[PDB]
Every structure is written in C-alpha cells, then in structure tokens.
Design a protein around this nucleic acid. Structure first.
Lengths: 56, 229, 115, 119, 122
RNA sequence: CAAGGAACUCUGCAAAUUAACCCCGUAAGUUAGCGAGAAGGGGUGCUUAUGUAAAAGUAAGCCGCAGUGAAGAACGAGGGG
RNA sequence: AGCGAAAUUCCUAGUCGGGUAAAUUCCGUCCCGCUUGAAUGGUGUAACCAUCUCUUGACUGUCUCGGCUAUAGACUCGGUG
RNA sequence: ACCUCGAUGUCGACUCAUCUCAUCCUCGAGCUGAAGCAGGUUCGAAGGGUUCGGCUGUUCGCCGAUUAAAGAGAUACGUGAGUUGGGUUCAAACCGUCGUGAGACAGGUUGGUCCCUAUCUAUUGUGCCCGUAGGAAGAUUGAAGAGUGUUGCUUCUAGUACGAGAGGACCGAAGCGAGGACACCUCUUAUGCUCCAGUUGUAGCGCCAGCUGCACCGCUGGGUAGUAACGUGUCUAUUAGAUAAACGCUGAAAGCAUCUAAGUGUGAAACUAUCUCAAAGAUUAAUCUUCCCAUUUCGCAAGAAAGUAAGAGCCGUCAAAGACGAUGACGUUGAUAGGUUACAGGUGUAAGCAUAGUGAUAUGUUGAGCUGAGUAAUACUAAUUGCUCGAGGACU
C-alpha cells in the first residue's frame, strides 16, 4: 500500500537492526597453508587431502 | 489412580476382520515397557503424577546432566522423557506392559501430536467456501473472506481478538476417544487399536484411559479360516 | 527404537488363507458368500470375470461382475475376507493385468479362454 | 507470471541430467550447481551399475541418456567406459562417484561443487 | 454424487418412463442421496397407458445408485444405473412387479413387500 | 478430475460437446433462391489379394480398450420482439 | 383499418388459458387504446442478424465440491535499482 | 443542515460473520372455555443452529416442497484498498407522453470501462535479543485463556392411563441417521511430469529392429509414495455446586394463614468446575529435580591473567519438519543422507531366439522384464584430522 505518514529515522534504525548479516566460518588447511572457510576448498584446491581441480 | 496411560509409537495401520462381519480399521503401536522415573504425590507434592521414560539408547550420545540424573536414580539411560498426570497405579522401579494393564475390551482415549504442515489457509482450517469463477471473479477469488466488523468512528474501528485468520496447522495434541483394543503381540510386543491415529508416520502417542466410559468392557473376538482344498 | 515396517505382515498373519487361487486379469470364477442371518446362513454364488488385482498384504482385492435382467453390477472383494468361497472354472487370455473396460462395453462382453 | 520462458519442466531436468552425465563420462570432472549434481549422481552410478553386466540390451538401455561430445562420439565414449571405468569399480558395492563443494560465485554466490570419479 | 436435480430411472412397472428427484428427505440440508433413503420425486416422462402422468409429485426410495456405497460387512458394491421404487404412502409399494437388482441396505429399514416380491436380493 | 447436468447466475458468460473424408438421410416455411453441411447416421488401423494410373471400392485375415488413435477441423432444436 | 398490458399500461403482480413441481420475465387471449394509430408510417413477412429474450436435447469443476501437477511469481540468496 | 461537497464510492448479492432479546425451536415452569391428544397465554432461558427452488435486477412480496424450527433487528438499510455487476447514476439511443422550440420524464426498454506493489495499529504464526538475580539441562502446576456443548427418526417400555369410541403419551432405555467439528490414507476413489505398458505423425541415432526430441506430461490405460475426499474412525454426553423464572418445608411480623422476615430444599441445553489444547514476558517473571563449576596475585581499595572440562553457537547430512529462520534426528564413538543389494508393490509375459506363419500376427523362453519417492541391511561415498561464545552463587 501507500505510506500515509513519513517513516522516522529511528524506525529505519530498528528495521535495519535485524537487516544485518553475521560472520562466516573459517578453518585451517594443513597441507596448503591457508585460512580457508570450513568444509570448503583451499587456495591450492584440496578440500580434504583430495584435489582433483587444477592448481592454477 | 483410575485414569491410566502409556506411551507408544504408531508403526502402521491395518484392517482386521471382526466378529459380526465388520471390517474394523486398525492401527499398530509399538510400546515398550516404559521406565518410571519419579512419582508426585497429590498431598505432599500437591498433585499426583508419574514421570515416565522410554527409548533407551547408548549412554555416549546422551547429554551429561540427564545421564547423571539417571545414574543417581540408577535406571536405564533413555532419550524420551515425559509425564502422565494423575497416574499412581504402580510403584517406582517397575516396567509396565499395557497387556497386563489395559484390557482387550476397554474403550480408550488416544492423543497424538498432529502432522506438521507449515502455514495453512483459512479454507483448509475452518472449512470456508471457495469463491466462484464465472461472471467475473477477480484474481483474488479464494481467501479468508471478509473481516469487516464496523465502519465509522463509533462503530467498531477495531480488529477482534480470536479473529478467524489463516495460520499454522498441525503439530498439536488431538483428542479421539472410544477406541477399541483387539490384538496383542508379545514376542514382538505390539498393540492393535481400532481406528486410526493422527500425526505423521511414526509419532509418539498417548494411549490414555477414556473419561466418559472408563468402566465399560465389551468383547470383540476374531475369526478363523477353516477352508482347504 | 529399531523399526521394521515388516512386522505388519507378521501381525497380519493372524488372518490368512492357505489356498489362495491365482488371479491376474481373466479368470471366469463364481464366488460364494456366507450371508449370515439369525438362522439358516445362506450361501450366495456370484459369477463373473476379474478385471485387475491390487494388494499389499491383507489388503488384496479383486473385481467381479454379473449381468442380470439387463442390469450389470460389479463388486470388489478382499481376498483374505472370511465367509467367502472362491471356485474357479475358466482361465482367460488377456494382454494387460489392469483392464477395466467392461464398464462401458455392451452385450457379448465375454472373452475367450486361455487355450 | 503469465507467458514467459517455458519454465523448469521435468523435460528440462531430463535434458540436463543427460547433458552433464555425458559431460562427466566424457572427461571425468565437472564444476556445477550443488543440487544439480546431488540429483545427478544417482543416474550416474545407476548407469555405472547397469553397464557392468556387458549385455547388448543393457547397452541399448545406456544409449538412452547419451549424446555425442566435442572430443569423442557415443560409440567410442561408451567403449572407453566399458573398457576402463567398469573394470575399475566392478568390485566395490556402491560409491561410484564423489563430489565436493567449491567456493561461492563472485556474481550470484551460487553453489558450485566439483564432481569427479576415482578410487 | 447423487443428489437434487437428477433425472433417474424407475425399477418398477408403473406405466412411467422418466422421473427426477425433487427433494431429499431430512432436516439441516441433507442434500445427498444414499441407498435405502426415502426421497421425493416427480415424473418427467411416462407412458399414456400408465397410472401416473407428467407433472405428478410422488415419493419413492432409491434402489440403485451409479456410485454405489460401501456395505458394513467390509465390501463395496457398484451399480450401473439409477432407479427408484414407488411407495404409496404406507409400507406397501405403489407397483406390483419388482424386476432387477436392489440394494440390501434397506432390509433392516422395513418395506419387506418389495423384498418378498423382488426377483433377487443382493 | 469421481457424481448430477443446470440446481450459482440477471443471463448455460465462460466452460464443455461436435469436429475432416467418403458415402445415407434431411420436415415445415416459402419470394421456389433457399432452408441445408438442416436435423438425425455409420464407419476411416495393419497385412494380403482383388485392384485402374495413382486413388477410391471390395474380399479375407489379424492387432489393439478404443485406430482423421498425435495436432490442425460449425454443438443443435423450437418460439417470441 | 390493422393490431394490441407489446421497446406502447398509471392504477397491474389486469382476466384466464399453454407449457413449467411451483412462471412480475416466457407464449396466447380478452379490448376500457389515462395518450396505439396510419408515410415521425402501420399490419405480417422468406433468408439472415458477432442482435434481445425464453423453453428444451447432449455436455460438463458455475454450484454441492475440493484437491492435485509443474512452472513464472511471491519467498531466500547474490547484482543494479 | 451540525460533522462532511480541496471526495463518507452512493442498492444488493457472493463468501465471512459479530452482537442484543423486544425467543424460531428443542429447555423449564405457571395458568386455562388444559378428557387425553392437539393446544393457547405468560415468564425465565440467546448454549447451538435454523433449507432448497420459481418469478423479479433484487430488498420486500407471493408461490412449491421440506424441515423441530424458515426469528426479531442492528453493525454506514454490515462488509469492493475481498469479487463483480442487474440499473437507477455519463453520453448512443428506441417507444409513449409533455412542449412550436431545443429538450424533459422517481416512465419503460437495448448495450454500456471499477485503481492501488501494506507504512502504523490490530489479527493468525513466526523468529533474534534480553530477562526473570551463578549457568545449563529436563520435568512441572497453572492466575489469566481458548474451542466446545445441534438433535431427528424408529422400536419397546405401553394401546397402559386418559377415554366412550375414535384418538392416543409424557419418565426411560436401546438402535438407526441428519448437520457440524475433530484425523487418516487400512476398504473406496481422484491426482500422481526422472514410474510402467501400448500407440500415431515427424526429425533422428548410418539400413531394419530398439530408443530419444516435439506434438496438453503428444495421446491412451494405469499406477509408487504422497496429497486430500464423496470413504472410514470419534464426538455431541455425564457429574457436582450456586442458581434464575418456579414450586416448597417450617414458620413469624399479621395468634389464623403465609416459600421469608431466622434456617432450609428441589428445580433449565442458561452460569461455574468437570469435556479438549496451549499456557510463567503471569515483571506477582511461579515450582521441583539433575548436572557443570566455585581455582596462587592487586585496584582510580581490591576478583586482574588458565576463561568448562556443562553447554550453546558456526558448518555439513537430511527430514515425521520446513516461506526463510526456527523445529526434529545424525555427523569415524555415526547407518544422517546419498549409493549398491534385497524385499514389497505396481506396470505387465522385456529384448533376443526358435517354430507356426511367404503376411500382419501367435506360441515357448516367462508372472518374464522394468520401475521416481516405499521398506531393511550395507561406511561403498559425502557429513573432516575444524572454529566462536561460554567455568569465580553478588548483595542484606
């Protein structure tokens, strides 16, 4: 519908308070030393000890 | 006291022929001899009840405080914990089988957490009509209908509390009464109860004593095949 | 706890028959029903062919039809139902195990037997 | 809304699963959408299972989800299949494919996962 | 399923050809027909040499419904036509020749004249 | 999409039915043009033969629950102003 | 003159009939036509009307009587906005 | 003509109802020109619900059949930021009339365009944060609440009473149903797009065969789980109290009488508990139980660094869940999901081969072959050999 009265700054603030985002997971890759995200692939490509993707 | 109760899991539903030539709908419930884990007195504890436990598993999976309480009580480590209000027919440290407790001719009450569904429409929930299609319907032609109560400043200007509004269906305890008992299995320990059971496939069920007719016991016996060629 | 979904048959074993004739889609059979009254239980003989067979356990059913005074009547019957008697006389030649078209087809709806 | 792209019909799903099963058995590795893989592996290893019998009717069957690729043609690729990938995994029951998720896309952050087959 | 505004047949020899349901007996909007239920009909087509002529409103009982109904014995029987028997304001039917099948869910409801004069009971 | 066939509605809106081919059959009205493709019918698959130039036609057998099997095909009648 | 409670009526839901389960609209009829009425034409009229209205044949999801199936949405995520 | 003409969309109907009794009913009682029966009047009682059609655009109105019962009314003659419009209510007009004239009719008739992507409040669910005086985990009662209590028919009690004959019961029980509310897919269906069988046209896979693409999922016949129903299963009770209209016992003022003035009773589906579900944000933040810990050294006069080992969260597997979040189960100490195998079920006699048959075709291989989601084993694969918050019982 159409607004009747203008929305105040503090209503904007309170609606934006739940309109934010959280952080993300992170982990260490043993062989390819890199601070990778948990249960993802590493910079060199090995998600586990397995790296079928090209290292380039 | 006089209204007893037990815990089960609906493992299926069947049809069984009965005396007087009637095909009665049947439901099979798996029911272990449940483990009592505390009694509450109507006078000292201000109300009588019995805390009951079932579905024992390996102690490794269970959380520490629960298993510690079980070890203090020194009974089996179980995952399912609940209560039955005002049941004192037995004592502590006993496993109760419904075969020895309930009768094969008793009318019973059954409650069960109903099937989870998500958000539901008013048409489904309160059986409202679906609007017609001809003569001009408008793309809204199936909804919760009118909610108008009053127009003008001093008429209503308000939404009522308890207004019939679409919401979430299921996942709540439903009450069906007068269910019958037909069949016992001891080697597999299954109970057959007339009718059907609400909720999804494989839910926890209260088999509880019927308040209205607790004293009635009528017999319903089976039939035997006697043919061969 | 440990679930089976197979003990359903074990608890249904309490009501089973030990004869169980074969029926797929073309058996011309007369079926008898022991209709119980207060006295002199009657034996009804109802003849016809079977259209299709559906079953999972005790829930096994078949179809059978008669045509009397121009009026046809078709009835389903559960196999494991007591007070029922089945005596087969003809085996037919059909192509599909699920057929239902005698509902519409007119007189001379009979089918040749399985040679 | 009303008239637009023909939508994501079941025929679209059949076409896709055929296309990337041919693609994976052609080369052996695909980065693709997570759920597309997750419902593709079943058809993959079902075909692998039915191909380890080496029967002409089973070959007629496995013709039914394959098209040619840019590297070989259907006959040569199925001969390659029967020659090496079936003898590789004839012994082990199940587990005929592996998948591991990749990083989120810069564009839409969609779920890439790399699908491949090895011991 | 069978209800008001339903041109059905007649299972009786009464000099009539076609008849339509005019209302269903029962309070609180019964609006539905089931086997053995007494209802009210009106003739739409009839023979000139019959006891009734078009426009007459009479009362009857459904004997056969196309959908049929499940019986309490555990079996369900399907019919292939919609016919009614005419009853003259008492337990006796209007007609004098009951030919064809008839529902058995009405034996316990009385009206045994039709049962005794029926060619068959199913 | 079971089951009724107009009970909703100001209206059978819409929806639904029919559908093409060939060959049957087609009232009244009347200005003798029409009505009219009125209405109301049937059937159309494969194989072989008869077959003419192909195609119709016919004979015989066979498959299938139904065969312009898929798509492209007027639903009518009456009466009033 | 013709015709007529009809695109013509105010007393009218006028008399009655015909069909219709039951008919202010449907068809006919009575003629008192508050004021029909004759080239602002009128009385009937064959075919026809993307015309108005009624009854009826088949037909059904408009209704008892709702539910499903997949999409494009909404919804969530990422991008402009 | 007072809000209101710098807009209050101006009749319903469709669905949806809410509320009062100045009761339609079943409920109870009183009285009768109340033999019974059928009645009529009044009071209390609003707990429940109270039809389908025909005409008309419809209210109203009448007609037909029901039904225990067709209520009275209001809520902008209820309700369009829910639907649309039958016409009054733009012209286009047509007919009758009025007026010399254009035009005019609360005169009739034909067709005649309905916008809105919810900001607040309130509502149904749903979450994050904190909270309730250590934390976590469970189990709890429940002040305030919510839904809900409709009855019909038949038989017997019994042609007993009433009565004269006909007519013809109330109290109760039983059985059978209607409508509505409460679930399920075991019987029944209906759908059932990675399922099965068949089939046509065409494009193809080099020819035939066998398969795929499109033709509504091409179509036809079905069908796994699932989803619901027209289907089953359940229910409308019953109990106790205060009672209302009411009838009272006793019994005074008012020596008799009197239901009241002392005490006290029975009495309605009305009311309250009992019937069924939620429910400690109920700040009055309530109860019980269990587990974890309580740890050298100081202040602007003091608890500063190991910050659980309890747990929770991040992530993944998924689904009895699911708008997303959450919810529920599982993560090498695991069968959580996927896979294989096996089973059930369904489709229905696969391909291929031989024979009969020059030919469609039929037979045997065969209850063969195939099967998306059902069922169980099975670490064969994926859920990692991970990260964050989080342990001093304060005070009188």
């Amino acid at each position: 519908a159409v607004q009747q009265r203008r929305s105040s700054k503090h209503r904007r603030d309170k609606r934006r308070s739940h309109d934010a985002l959280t952080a993300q997971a992170l982990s260490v890759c043993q062989k390819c030393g890199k601070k990778k995200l948990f249960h993802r692939v590493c910079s060199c490509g090995m998600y586990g000890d397995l790296r079928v993707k090209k290292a380039y | 006291m006089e209204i007893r109760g037990i815990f089960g899991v609906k493992v299926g539903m069947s049809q069984v022929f009965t005396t007087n030539n009637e095909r009665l709908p049947i439901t099979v419930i798996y029911c272990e001899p449940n483990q009592v884990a505390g009694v509450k007195t109507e006078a000292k504890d201000k109300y009588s009840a019995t805390l009951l436990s079932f579905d024992t598993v390996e102690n490794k999976k269970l959380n520490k405080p629960q298993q510690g309480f079980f070890e203090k009580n020194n009974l089996k480590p179980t995952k399912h914990l609940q209560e039955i209000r005002n049941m004192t027919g037995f004592e502590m440290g006993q496993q109760i089988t419904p075969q020895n407790l309930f009768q094969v001719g008793e009318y019973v009450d059954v409650s069960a957490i109903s099937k989870g569904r998500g958000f539901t429409g008013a048409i489904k929930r309160w059986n409202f009509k679906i609007g017609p299609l001809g003569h001009g319907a408008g793309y809204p032609h199936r909804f919760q209908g009118s909610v108008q109560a009053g127009r003008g400043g001093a008429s209503a200007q308000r939404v009522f509390k308890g207004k019939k509004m679409s919401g979430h269906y299921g996942h709540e305890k439903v009450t069906v009464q007068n269910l019958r008992i037909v069949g016992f299995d001891e080697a597999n320990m299954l109970v057959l109860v007339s009718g059907a059971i609400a909720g999804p496939e494989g839910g926890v069920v209260l088999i509880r004593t019927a308040k209205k007719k607790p004293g009635v016991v009528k017999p319903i016996e089976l039939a035997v095949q006697t043919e061969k060629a | 706890k440990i679930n089976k979904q197979a003990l359903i048959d074990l608890v249904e074993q309490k009501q089973l028959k030990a004869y169980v004739p074969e029926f797929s889609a073309g058996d011309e059979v007369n079926v008898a029903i022991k209709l119980k009254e207060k006295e002199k239980v009657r034996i009804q003989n109802f003849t016809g062919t079977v259209l299709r067979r559906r079953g999972k356990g005790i829930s096994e059913t078949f179809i059978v039809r008669k045509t009397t005074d121009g009026i046809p009547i078709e009835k389903n019957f559960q196999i494991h139902n007591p007070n029922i008697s089945i005596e087969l006389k003809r085996r037919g030649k059909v192509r599909r195990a699920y057929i239902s078209y005698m509902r519409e087809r007119s007189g001379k709806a009979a089918k040749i037997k399985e040679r | 809304s009303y008239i637009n792209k023909p939508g994501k019909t079941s025929a679209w799903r059949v076409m896709t699963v055929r296309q990337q099963v041919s693609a994976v058995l052609a080369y052996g590795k695909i980065e693709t959408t997570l759920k597309k893989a997750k419902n593709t592996q079943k058809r993959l290893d079902k075909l692998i299972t039915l191909a380890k019998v080496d029967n002409f009717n089973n070959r007629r069957q496995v013709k039914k989800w394959l098209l040619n690729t840019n590297l070989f043609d259907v006959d040569q690729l199925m001969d390659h299949l029967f020659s090496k990938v079936a003898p590789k995994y004839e012994k082990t029951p199940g587990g005929y494919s592996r998948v591991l998720k990749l990083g989120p896309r810069r564009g839409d952050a969609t779920e890439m996962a790399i699908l491949q087959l090895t011991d | 399923m069978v209800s008001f505004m339903t041109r059905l047949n007649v299972a009786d020899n009464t000099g009539a050809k076609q008849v339509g349901i005019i209302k269903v007996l029962g309070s609180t909007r019964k609006r539905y027909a089931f086997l053995g239920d007494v209802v009210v009909v009106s003739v739409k087509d009839a023979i000139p040499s019959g006891m009734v002529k078009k426009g007459q409103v009479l009362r009857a009982v459904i004997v056969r419904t196309k959908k049929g109904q499940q019986r309490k014995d555990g079996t369900h029987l399907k019919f292939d036509d919609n016919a009614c028997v005419l009853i003259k304001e008492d337990k006796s039917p209007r007609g004098t020749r009951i030919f064809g099948p008839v529902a058995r869910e009405l034996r316990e409801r009385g009206y045994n004249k039709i049962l005794s004069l029926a060619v068959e009971v199913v």
